[PDB]
Write a protein that binds this ligand. Sequence first.
Ligand SMILES: CCCN(CCC)C[C@@H]1CCCCN1CCNC(=O)N1c2ccccc2C(=O)Nc2cccnc21
Length: 381
Amino acid sequence: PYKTFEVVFIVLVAGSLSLVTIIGNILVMVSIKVNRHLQTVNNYFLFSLACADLIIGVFSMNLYTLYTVIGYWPLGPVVCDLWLALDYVVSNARVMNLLIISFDRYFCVTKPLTYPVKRTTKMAGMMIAAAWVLSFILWAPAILFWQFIVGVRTVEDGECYIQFFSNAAVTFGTAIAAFYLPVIIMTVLYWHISRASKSRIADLEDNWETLNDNLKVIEKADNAAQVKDALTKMRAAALDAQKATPPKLSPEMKDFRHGFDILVGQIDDALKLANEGKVKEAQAAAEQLKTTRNAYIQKYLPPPSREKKVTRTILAILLAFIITWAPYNVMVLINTFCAPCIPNTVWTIGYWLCYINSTINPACYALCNATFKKTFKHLLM
Ligand SMILES: CCCN(CCC)C[C@@H]1CCCCN1CCNC(=O)N1c2ccccc2C(=O)Nc2cccnc21
Protein backbone atom coordinates (compact mmCIF):
# COMPACT_ATOMS: atom_id res chain seq x y z
CA PRO A 1 0.00 0.00 0.00
CA TYR A 2 2.20 2.81 1.31
CA LYS A 3 5.42 0.78 1.11
CA THR A 4 6.12 1.80 -2.51
CA PHE A 5 6.86 5.42 -1.60
CA GLU A 6 8.70 3.95 1.39
CA VAL A 7 11.00 2.02 -0.95
CA VAL A 8 11.59 5.10 -3.13
CA PHE A 9 12.34 7.14 -0.01
CA ILE A 10 14.75 4.43 1.14
CA VAL A 11 16.79 4.28 -2.07
CA LEU A 12 16.85 8.08 -2.37
CA VAL A 13 17.92 8.84 1.21
CA ALA A 14 20.39 5.93 1.30
CA GLY A 15 21.97 6.93 -2.01
CA SER A 16 22.26 10.50 -0.75
CA LEU A 17 23.97 9.28 2.44
CA SER A 18 26.46 7.18 0.47
CA LEU A 19 27.21 9.99 -1.98
CA VAL A 20 27.74 12.63 0.73
CA THR A 21 30.01 10.23 2.62
CA ILE A 22 32.07 9.52 -0.51
CA ILE A 23 32.40 13.22 -1.39
CA GLY A 24 33.37 14.23 2.15
CA ASN A 25 36.00 11.59 2.84
CA ILE A 26 37.41 11.88 -0.69
CA LEU A 27 37.74 15.64 -0.22
CA VAL A 28 39.58 14.99 3.05
CA MET A 29 41.97 12.48 1.47
CA VAL A 30 42.74 14.58 -1.62
CA SER A 31 43.14 17.68 0.55
CA ILE A 32 45.68 15.92 2.78
CA LYS A 33 47.63 14.42 -0.13
CA VAL A 34 47.74 17.76 -1.98
CA ASN A 35 48.28 20.44 0.67
CA ARG A 36 51.69 20.22 2.33
CA HIS A 37 50.47 22.04 5.47
CA LEU A 38 47.93 19.22 5.99
CA GLN A 39 50.74 16.62 6.13
CA THR A 40 51.08 16.35 9.92
CA VAL A 41 50.72 13.20 12.01
CA ASN A 42 47.25 14.19 13.23
CA ASN A 43 46.23 14.32 9.57
CA TYR A 44 47.85 10.92 9.03
CA PHE A 45 45.51 9.46 11.64
CA LEU A 46 42.61 11.45 10.18
CA PHE A 47 43.64 10.13 6.76
CA SER A 48 43.39 6.51 7.92
CA LEU A 49 40.02 7.29 9.52
CA ALA A 50 38.82 8.97 6.31
CA CYS A 51 39.92 5.87 4.40
CA ALA A 52 37.82 3.61 6.62
CA ASP A 53 34.84 5.95 6.24
CA LEU A 54 35.30 5.94 2.45
CA ILE A 55 35.32 2.13 2.42
CA ILE A 56 32.11 2.18 4.46
CA GLY A 57 30.49 4.75 2.19
CA VAL A 58 31.34 2.86 -1.00
CA PHE A 59 30.58 -0.75 0.02
CA SER A 60 28.72 -1.27 3.30
CA MET A 61 26.03 1.39 2.79
CA ASN A 62 25.09 0.22 -0.71
CA LEU A 63 25.28 -3.47 0.18
CA TYR A 64 23.02 -2.97 3.20
CA THR A 65 20.60 -0.95 1.06
CA LEU A 66 20.61 -3.84 -1.42
CA TYR A 67 19.88 -6.30 1.40
CA THR A 68 17.00 -4.30 2.87
CA VAL A 69 15.40 -3.41 -0.48
CA ILE A 70 15.59 -6.93 -1.90
CA GLY A 71 14.71 -8.63 1.40
CA TYR A 72 17.51 -11.21 1.21
CA TRP A 73 21.15 -11.55 0.18
CA PRO A 74 21.20 -11.98 -3.63
CA LEU A 75 24.92 -12.00 -4.47
CA GLY A 76 26.29 -15.19 -2.93
CA PRO A 77 28.12 -16.73 0.03
CA VAL A 78 31.57 -15.67 -1.19
CA VAL A 79 30.53 -12.02 -1.49
CA CYS A 80 28.66 -12.31 1.82
CA ASP A 81 31.73 -13.48 3.73
CA LEU A 82 33.84 -10.86 1.94
CA TRP A 83 31.47 -8.13 3.12
CA LEU A 84 31.35 -9.51 6.68
CA ALA A 85 35.15 -9.63 6.87
CA LEU A 86 35.36 -6.13 5.38
CA ASP A 87 32.85 -4.58 7.79
CA TYR A 88 34.49 -6.24 10.81
CA VAL A 89 38.08 -5.43 9.84
CA VAL A 90 37.11 -1.82 9.13
CA SER A 91 35.20 -1.38 12.40
CA ASN A 92 38.07 -2.88 14.42
CA ALA A 93 40.51 -0.64 12.53
CA ARG A 94 38.28 2.32 13.43
CA VAL A 95 38.34 1.46 17.14
CA MET A 96 42.11 0.96 17.12
CA ASN A 97 42.59 4.17 15.12
CA LEU A 98 40.59 6.16 17.67
CA LEU A 99 42.63 4.57 20.46
CA ILE A 100 45.81 5.63 18.65
CA ILE A 101 44.53 9.21 18.41
CA SER A 102 43.49 9.23 22.08
CA PHE A 103 46.82 7.91 23.37
CA ASP A 104 48.74 10.25 21.05
CA ARG A 105 46.93 13.32 22.39
CA TYR A 106 47.24 12.05 25.97
CA PHE A 107 51.01 11.68 25.62
CA CYS A 108 51.25 15.07 23.91
CA VAL A 109 49.61 16.69 26.94
CA THR A 110 51.17 14.61 29.74
CA LYS A 111 54.77 14.46 28.40
CA PRO A 112 55.29 17.85 26.72
CA LEU A 113 59.10 17.60 26.81
CA THR A 114 59.98 14.08 25.63
CA TYR A 115 57.08 13.00 23.41
CA PRO A 116 56.72 15.73 20.72
CA VAL A 117 60.20 15.13 19.28
CA LYS A 118 59.40 11.41 18.89
CA ARG A 119 56.23 12.09 16.84
CA THR A 120 57.30 11.46 13.24
CA THR A 121 55.34 10.65 10.11
CA LYS A 122 57.11 7.28 9.84
CA MET A 123 55.88 6.33 13.32
CA ALA A 124 52.34 7.48 12.48
CA GLY A 125 52.17 5.50 9.24
CA MET A 126 53.86 2.53 10.91
CA MET A 127 51.27 2.48 13.69
CA ILE A 128 48.26 2.84 11.39
CA ALA A 129 49.70 0.12 9.16
CA ALA A 130 50.11 -2.08 12.23
CA ALA A 131 46.49 -1.26 13.13
CA TRP A 132 45.02 -2.32 9.79
CA VAL A 133 47.24 -5.43 9.70
CA LEU A 134 46.19 -6.41 13.23
CA SER A 135 42.50 -5.94 12.43
CA PHE A 136 42.75 -7.95 9.20
CA ILE A 137 44.70 -10.83 10.76
CA LEU A 138 42.31 -10.90 13.73
CA TRP A 139 38.96 -10.91 11.92
CA ALA A 140 39.44 -11.93 8.28
CA PRO A 141 40.58 -15.60 8.54
CA ALA A 142 37.96 -16.50 11.16
CA ILE A 143 35.07 -15.01 9.16
CA LEU A 144 36.32 -16.47 5.88
CA PHE A 145 37.29 -19.98 7.04
CA TRP A 146 35.13 -20.80 10.08
CA GLN A 147 32.82 -22.71 7.73
CA PHE A 148 35.73 -25.00 6.87
CA ILE A 149 36.89 -25.22 10.49
CA VAL A 150 33.58 -26.78 11.60
CA GLY A 151 33.20 -28.64 8.29
CA VAL A 152 29.73 -27.20 7.61
CA ARG A 153 28.17 -23.94 6.43
CA THR A 154 25.05 -23.31 8.52
CA VAL A 155 24.30 -19.95 6.86
CA GLU A 156 21.09 -20.49 4.89
CA ASP A 157 20.92 -19.62 1.20
CA GLY A 158 19.86 -15.98 0.89
CA GLU A 159 21.01 -14.84 4.35
CA CYS A 160 24.30 -13.28 5.46
CA TYR A 161 25.65 -13.53 9.01
CA ILE A 162 28.57 -14.93 11.03
CA GLN A 163 28.31 -18.50 12.28
CA PHE A 164 30.65 -18.38 15.27
CA PHE A 165 28.71 -15.43 16.76
CA SER A 166 25.85 -17.83 17.53
CA ASN A 167 27.33 -18.46 20.99
CA ALA A 168 26.30 -15.59 23.27
CA ALA A 169 29.59 -15.85 25.18
CA VAL A 170 31.76 -14.82 22.22
CA THR A 171 29.31 -11.99 21.45
CA PHE A 172 29.47 -10.71 25.03
CA GLY A 173 33.24 -10.98 25.36
CA THR A 174 33.60 -9.45 21.90
CA ALA A 175 31.34 -6.57 22.91
CA ILE A 176 33.39 -5.99 26.07
CA ALA A 177 36.84 -6.23 24.48
CA ALA A 178 36.02 -4.58 21.14
CA PHE A 179 33.81 -1.67 22.22
CA TYR A 180 33.04 -1.02 25.89
CA LEU A 181 36.56 -1.36 27.29
CA PRO A 182 38.07 0.82 24.50
CA VAL A 183 35.34 3.42 25.12
CA ILE A 184 36.21 3.51 28.83
CA ILE A 185 39.89 3.88 27.92
CA MET A 186 39.12 6.80 25.59
CA THR A 187 36.97 8.40 28.30
CA VAL A 188 39.72 8.26 30.93
CA LEU A 189 42.32 9.43 28.40
CA TYR A 190 40.27 12.43 27.28
CA TRP A 191 39.47 13.16 30.93
CA HIS A 192 43.18 13.46 31.72
CA ILE A 193 43.66 15.46 28.52
CA SER A 194 41.17 17.98 29.91
CA ARG A 195 42.46 17.97 33.49
CA ALA A 196 46.14 18.31 32.54
CA SER A 197 45.40 21.18 30.12
CA LYS A 198 43.32 23.11 32.65
CA SER A 199 45.56 24.89 35.12
CA ARG A 200 47.06 28.36 35.57
CA ILE A 201 46.29 31.33 33.35
CA ALA A 202 44.45 29.21 30.77
CA ASP A 203 41.56 28.57 33.17
CA LEU A 204 41.59 32.23 34.22
CA GLU A 205 42.50 33.48 30.72
CA ASP A 206 39.39 31.74 29.33
CA ASN A 207 37.72 35.06 30.24
CA TRP A 208 39.69 36.47 27.33
CA GLU A 209 38.28 34.05 24.77
CA THR A 210 34.95 34.88 26.43
CA LEU A 211 35.18 38.59 25.66
CA ASN A 212 36.52 37.70 22.20
CA ASP A 213 33.67 35.35 21.27
CA ASN A 214 31.20 37.84 22.74
CA LEU A 215 32.83 40.54 20.60
CA LYS A 216 32.22 38.34 17.55
CA VAL A 217 28.61 37.90 18.72
CA ILE A 218 28.31 41.69 18.91
CA GLU A 219 29.58 41.87 15.32
CA LYS A 220 26.79 39.57 14.04
CA ALA A 221 24.01 40.86 16.30
CA ASP A 222 20.53 41.96 15.22
CA ASN A 223 18.86 43.73 18.18
CA ALA A 224 19.68 45.62 21.36
CA ALA A 225 19.02 42.62 23.62
CA GLN A 226 21.80 40.60 21.96
CA VAL A 227 24.44 43.33 22.32
CA LYS A 228 23.08 43.95 25.82
CA ASP A 229 23.59 40.32 26.85
CA ALA A 230 26.98 39.91 25.16
CA LEU A 231 28.03 43.32 26.51
CA THR A 232 27.21 42.46 30.13
CA LYS A 233 28.99 39.12 29.73
CA MET A 234 31.98 41.06 28.40
CA ARG A 235 31.84 43.23 31.52
CA ALA A 236 31.89 40.11 33.71
CA ALA A 237 34.88 38.70 31.81
CA ALA A 238 36.73 42.02 32.07
CA LEU A 239 36.05 42.37 35.80
CA ASP A 240 37.17 38.82 36.59
CA ALA A 241 40.19 39.22 34.30
CA GLN A 242 41.14 42.54 35.92
CA LYS A 243 42.07 41.10 39.32
CA ALA A 244 43.89 38.32 37.43
CA THR A 245 47.67 38.56 37.54
CA PRO A 246 49.38 37.93 34.18
CA PRO A 247 52.44 35.65 33.95
CA LYS A 248 54.98 38.46 33.50
CA LEU A 249 55.65 39.14 37.19
CA SER A 250 53.56 48.00 39.93
CA PRO A 251 55.50 50.16 37.40
CA GLU A 252 54.13 49.33 33.94
CA MET A 253 51.83 46.95 35.86
CA LYS A 254 49.31 49.64 36.76
CA ASP A 255 49.27 49.80 32.97
CA PHE A 256 47.78 46.29 32.88
CA ARG A 257 45.08 47.04 35.46
CA HIS A 258 44.47 50.48 33.96
CA GLY A 259 43.66 48.85 30.62
CA PHE A 260 40.81 46.91 32.19
CA ASP A 261 39.86 50.01 34.19
CA ILE A 262 39.27 51.74 30.85
CA LEU A 263 37.87 48.62 29.16
CA VAL A 264 35.00 48.24 31.64
CA GLY A 265 34.32 51.96 31.23
CA GLN A 266 33.93 51.58 27.48
CA ILE A 267 31.72 48.55 28.11
CA ASP A 268 29.58 50.83 30.27
CA ASP A 269 29.47 53.51 27.57
CA ALA A 270 28.36 50.95 24.99
CA LEU A 271 25.95 49.33 27.48
CA LYS A 272 24.11 52.57 28.23
CA LEU A 273 24.40 53.20 24.48
CA ALA A 274 22.63 49.84 24.00
CA ASN A 275 19.90 50.31 26.63
CA GLU A 276 18.19 52.81 24.31
CA GLY A 277 18.73 50.71 21.18
CA LYS A 278 21.69 52.27 19.36
CA VAL A 279 22.78 48.87 18.06
CA LYS A 280 25.35 49.75 15.39
CA GLU A 281 26.77 52.59 17.49
CA ALA A 282 27.31 50.10 20.32
CA GLN A 283 28.97 47.80 17.77
CA ALA A 284 31.47 50.49 16.72
CA ALA A 285 32.08 51.21 20.41
CA ALA A 286 32.84 47.49 20.73
CA GLU A 287 35.33 47.90 17.88
CA GLN A 288 37.24 50.60 19.76
CA LEU A 289 36.99 48.27 22.76
CA LYS A 290 38.72 45.70 20.55
CA THR A 291 41.45 48.26 19.84
CA THR A 292 42.22 48.81 23.54
CA ARG A 293 42.08 45.04 24.00
CA ASN A 294 44.50 44.64 21.07
CA ALA A 295 46.99 46.96 22.78
CA TYR A 296 46.97 44.87 25.94
CA ILE A 297 47.12 41.56 24.04
CA GLN A 298 50.30 42.62 22.27
CA LYS A 299 51.61 43.95 25.59
CA TYR A 300 51.12 41.28 28.25
CA LEU A 301 49.63 38.09 26.83
CA PRO A 302 51.20 34.65 26.23
CA PRO A 303 50.76 32.78 22.91
CA PRO A 304 47.30 31.41 22.06
CA SER A 305 46.06 27.90 22.81
CA ARG A 306 46.20 26.16 19.44
CA GLU A 307 46.39 22.77 21.17
CA LYS A 308 43.14 23.43 23.06
CA LYS A 309 41.09 23.59 19.86
CA VAL A 310 42.82 20.33 18.92
CA THR A 311 41.40 18.81 22.11
CA ARG A 312 37.97 20.14 21.10
CA THR A 313 38.32 18.32 17.76
CA ILE A 314 39.40 15.09 19.48
CA LEU A 315 36.31 15.31 21.68
CA ALA A 316 34.19 15.83 18.55
CA ILE A 317 35.53 12.66 16.92
CA LEU A 318 35.28 10.51 20.05
CA LEU A 319 31.75 11.68 20.86
CA ALA A 320 30.75 11.04 17.25
CA PHE A 321 31.92 7.42 17.44
CA ILE A 322 30.58 6.73 20.94
CA ILE A 323 27.13 8.26 20.42
CA THR A 324 26.66 6.70 16.98
CA TRP A 325 27.86 3.22 17.99
CA ALA A 326 26.29 2.85 21.45
CA PRO A 327 22.75 1.84 20.31
CA TYR A 328 23.97 -1.01 18.10
CA ASN A 329 26.13 -2.48 20.87
CA VAL A 330 23.23 -2.19 23.32
CA MET A 331 21.08 -4.06 20.81
CA VAL A 332 23.75 -6.77 20.66
CA LEU A 333 23.82 -7.11 24.46
CA ILE A 334 20.02 -7.33 24.66
CA ASN A 335 20.01 -9.75 21.71
CA THR A 336 22.27 -12.11 23.67
CA PHE A 337 19.26 -13.12 25.80
CA CYS A 338 16.07 -11.58 24.31
CA ALA A 339 15.91 -11.74 20.52
CA PRO A 340 12.26 -10.58 20.15
CA CYS A 341 13.08 -7.50 22.27
CA ILE A 342 14.81 -5.86 19.27
CA PRO A 343 12.66 -5.49 16.13
CA ASN A 344 14.22 -5.26 12.70
CA THR A 345 13.40 -1.56 12.41
CA VAL A 346 15.56 -0.56 15.37
CA TRP A 347 18.31 -2.91 14.16
CA THR A 348 18.22 -0.98 10.88
CA ILE A 349 18.46 2.22 12.93
CA GLY A 350 21.63 0.97 14.63
CA TYR A 351 23.28 -0.12 11.38
CA TRP A 352 22.51 3.19 9.68
CA LEU A 353 23.69 5.03 12.81
CA CYS A 354 27.19 3.54 12.63
CA TYR A 355 27.29 4.18 8.88
CA ILE A 356 26.09 7.73 9.60
CA ASN A 357 29.11 8.07 11.91
CA SER A 358 31.21 7.34 8.84
CA THR A 359 29.21 10.11 7.14
CA ILE A 360 29.73 12.74 9.84
CA ASN A 361 33.43 12.33 10.72
CA PRO A 362 34.63 14.89 8.09
CA ALA A 363 32.32 17.52 9.57
CA CYS A 364 33.86 16.66 12.94
CA TYR A 365 37.49 17.25 11.99
CA ALA A 366 37.69 18.82 8.50
CA LEU A 367 34.82 21.31 8.17
CA CYS A 368 35.76 23.19 11.37
CA ASN A 369 39.40 23.60 10.27
CA ALA A 370 40.66 26.69 8.45
CA THR A 371 43.33 24.89 6.41
CA PHE A 372 40.95 22.11 5.35
CA LYS A 373 38.43 24.79 4.36
CA LYS A 374 41.02 26.64 2.27
CA THR A 375 42.01 23.42 0.49
CA PHE A 376 38.33 22.57 -0.03
CA LYS A 377 37.60 25.95 -1.62
CA HIS A 378 40.71 25.52 -3.78
CA LEU A 379 39.67 22.04 -4.94
CA LEU A 380 36.02 22.84 -5.64
CA MET A 381 36.64 26.18 -7.38
C1 LIG B 1 26.79 -8.49 12.41
C2 LIG B 1 27.48 -7.55 11.46
C3 LIG B 1 26.53 -6.52 10.89
N1 LIG B 1 27.15 -5.59 9.95
C4 LIG B 1 26.97 -6.02 8.56
C5 LIG B 1 28.15 -6.80 8.01
C6 LIG B 1 27.91 -7.22 6.60
C7 LIG B 1 26.73 -4.19 10.16
C8 LIG B 1 27.42 -3.84 11.48
C9 LIG B 1 26.74 -2.73 12.27
C10 LIG B 1 27.01 -1.37 11.64
C11 LIG B 1 28.49 -1.15 11.45
C12 LIG B 1 29.10 -2.28 10.65
N2 LIG B 1 28.86 -3.58 11.28
C13 LIG B 1 29.67 -3.75 12.49
C14 LIG B 1 30.68 -4.86 12.69
N3 LIG B 1 31.27 -4.82 14.02
C15 LIG B 1 30.74 -5.57 14.98
O1 LIG B 1 29.76 -6.30 14.85
N4 LIG B 1 31.40 -5.48 16.24
C16 LIG B 1 32.62 -4.75 16.38
C17 LIG B 1 33.78 -5.21 15.76
C18 LIG B 1 34.96 -4.50 15.92
C19 LIG B 1 35.00 -3.35 16.68
C20 LIG B 1 33.85 -2.89 17.30
C21 LIG B 1 32.65 -3.58 17.16
C22 LIG B 1 31.47 -3.02 17.88
O2 LIG B 1 31.32 -1.80 17.94
N5 LIG B 1 30.56 -3.84 18.44
C23 LIG B 1 30.46 -5.25 18.48
C24 LIG B 1 29.96 -5.87 19.62
C25 LIG B 1 29.85 -7.25 19.64
C26 LIG B 1 30.25 -7.96 18.53
N6 LIG B 1 30.74 -7.40 17.42
C27 LIG B 1 30.84 -6.06 17.41
